[PDB]
């Protein structure tokens, strides 16, 4: 496996629901590679009988510098217009993945909790959800990482 994840730091946590995600990603590339890396963030909500996902954002890195690389991936937040109110204030998941030439080789999953920023709203939640008061707390120190064996070059 030519590219490996050496560290992931969530820079802004907790944050407002509407704040972009800021991931400081450190990875190593052992050999020169022909193609691009794609980093992608996906939202997964489970409030329905089946899952409903939101692809949030993605960026390409290419060509891949050989050595140790550090950069910040700033990913757009979820669209609350697509999320039922009960799921806005529940535990959800985000998946941070990297693919090489379209082939996913690492996935970092996080639990995310969403709660109001004031005790009185937490215990007396308003009829209409107030997204401006929702704070998201990523469980960033317990990442659930999956690796996949891929063809490289």
């Amino acid at each position: 496996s030519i590219v490996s994840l050496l560290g992931i730091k969530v820079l802004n946590n907790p944050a407002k629901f509407t704040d972009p995600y800021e991931f400081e990603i450190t990875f190593e590339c052992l050999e020169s590679l022909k193609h691009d890396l794609e980093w992608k963030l996906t939202y997964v909500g489970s409030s329905r009988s089946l899952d409903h996902d939101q692809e949030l954002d993605s960026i390409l890195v290419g060509p891949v510098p050989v050595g140790v690389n550090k950069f910040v991936f700033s990913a757009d937040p979820p669209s609350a217009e697509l999320i039922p109110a009960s799921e806005l204030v529940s535990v959800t998941v985000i998946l941070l993945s990297c693919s090489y030439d379209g082939r996913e080789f690492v996935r970092v999953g996080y639990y995310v909790n969403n709660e109001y920023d004031e005790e009185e709203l937490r215990e007396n939640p308003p009829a209409k959800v107030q997204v401006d008061h929702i704070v998201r707390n990523i469980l960033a120190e317990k990442p659930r990482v999956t690796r996949f064996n891929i063809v490289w070059d």
Partner: antibody
Amino acid sequence: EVQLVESGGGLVQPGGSLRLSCAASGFNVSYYSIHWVRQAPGKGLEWVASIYPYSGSTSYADSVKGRFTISADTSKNTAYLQMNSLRAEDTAVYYCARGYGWALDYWGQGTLVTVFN
Amino acid sequence: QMTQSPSSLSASVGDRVTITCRASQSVSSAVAWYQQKPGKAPKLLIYSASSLYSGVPSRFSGSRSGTDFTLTISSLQPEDFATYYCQQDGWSLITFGQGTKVEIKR
């Protein structure tokens, strides 16, 4: 080439202690989560403890919190379960397992912990 | 909590069987299925509720419907008679179901 090999099981009396070792082969423990899961004879699987990559953060089953500690030595590429204040309930085969996302892909053969009076 | 049912079932080669676990939360990423035979370590079958682990035969599948997670074996083969466990990896705790022993009819 991936392997996990548990050691350190043995006979111990209540109130005693044991330190289990999980020797990782084919991968670096610092980049994967590592988990201890136990099985009493003829009974089901019971999760004990988890440690997570990059930060060494930990989780514990309620019935072992304050008693067991999970850790990993990156230099030795080995995970540990320090088992303090052991009780009759703790007798089991203890498996070490590697995290695969939210699941567990590779399991060792287990080491037997036998509490006896 | 992960309530697994049935605790055992008897079936024939070629039978389609389903095993269900009822979770306290509906997050799909959190649920996995394992096989275990006497004297052997558990084996991963399904992860993230519905994804088949590499090398597992296609007759195994998993699905989620709300808080019900289901393992289906489309046609039991001789090597499939074993005990099956579901797992939920939650925010704070991992929970295993009590297991389902799949025994062979004669």
